[PDB]
Amino acid sequence: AWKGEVLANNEAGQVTSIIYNPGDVITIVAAGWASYGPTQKWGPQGDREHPDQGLICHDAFCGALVMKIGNSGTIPVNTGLFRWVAPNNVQGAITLIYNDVPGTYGNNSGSFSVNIGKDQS
Amino acid sequence: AWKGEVLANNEAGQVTSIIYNPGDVITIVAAGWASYGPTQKWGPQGDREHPDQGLICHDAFCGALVMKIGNSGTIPVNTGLFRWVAPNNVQGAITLIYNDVPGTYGNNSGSFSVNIGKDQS
Ligand SMILES: *C(=O)c1ccc(O[C@@H]2O[C@H](CO)[C@H](O)[C@H](O)[C@H]2O)cc1
Ligand SMILES: *C(=O)c1ccc(O[C@@H]2O[C@H](CO)[C@H](O)[C@H](O)[C@H]2O)cc1
Ligand SMILES: [Ca+2]
Ligand SMILES: [Ca+2]
């Protein structure tokens, strides 16, 4: 299992120790407060009121937690995933990323604390 | 394992099928959007800007997810718990509740989708 912080201003994302292999079942729980710029902060589901101005993940709100697995596109994580299995052909190291517009991470603040484990399968 | 919705306007709380027994390790993931009255909505961590005006749980924000185990006091859940063990002497059915001021649940709306499972131990 892995536990760590994902900083909102980390554009490259936080690489975890989890290698997702075909058939793996995983659970993620994410908590905390972060901002993409405004004084307010939002949880891991991001800001449901903010328009998408070119986010790295179009299937989650600005300020949400998302992930990539190996060479995958971004996949929404939000508050987490419960005994979740990846789509076919998705595999590799899990990187966690704050959802923002590329090039605009400099003014971000806060972080999410995240646990990832592999479940029985 | 249990999956269900917890309505924000449900003052008594949502009883789950989970009975927490001594030694149990559990994982909870909570998602979704709800309100304690305003037109806006918040995630399972609630509204970090709203003062505590007499919440059923003083250790979580208004609009956060909390729980009771048997006849325990409220315990914060927020976005969830990862491989969590209860304090000594705490056991019984898990009830999930929206954190609001007693008697003020009538104007609440929305719900959280919640998964609870027992982990290997
Ligand atoms: C309203 O016009 C408005 C409020 C805040 C805001 O913040 C920017 O959002 C961008 C992503 O959409 C990016 O994160 C910038 O760094 C933020 O300052 C934009 C617009
Ligand atoms: C101040 O701007 C303000 C005060 C209260 C409020 O909503 C009420 O919050 C209560 C809990 O603190 C309770 O949930 C009531 O039902 C709400 O109407 C909004 C804004
Ligand atoms: Ca930004
Ligand atoms: Ca209310």
Swiss-Prot record, chains A, B:
Gene3D superfamilies: Galactose-binding lectin (2.60.120.430). It is found in: Cytoplasm; Periplasm; Cell surface. Pfam families: PA-IL (PF07828). GO terms for cellular component: cell surface; cytoplasm; periplasmic space. One of its GO terms (biological process) is heterophilic cell-cell adhesion via plasma membrane cell adhesion molecules. Keywords: Cytoplasm, Lectin, Periplasm. The keyword Iron-sulfur does not apply. Belongs to the LecA/PllA lectin family. D-galactose specific lectin. Binds in decreasing order of affinity: melibiose, methyl-alpha-D-galactoside, D-galactose, methyl-beta-D-galactoside, N-acetyl-D-galactosamine. Similar to plant lectins in its selective (carbohydrate-specific) hemagglutinating activity. This is PA-I galactophilic lectin. It comes from Pseudomonas aeruginosa (strain ATCC 15692 / DSM 22644 / CIP 104116 / JCM 14847 / LMG 12228 / 1C / PRS 101 / PAO1).
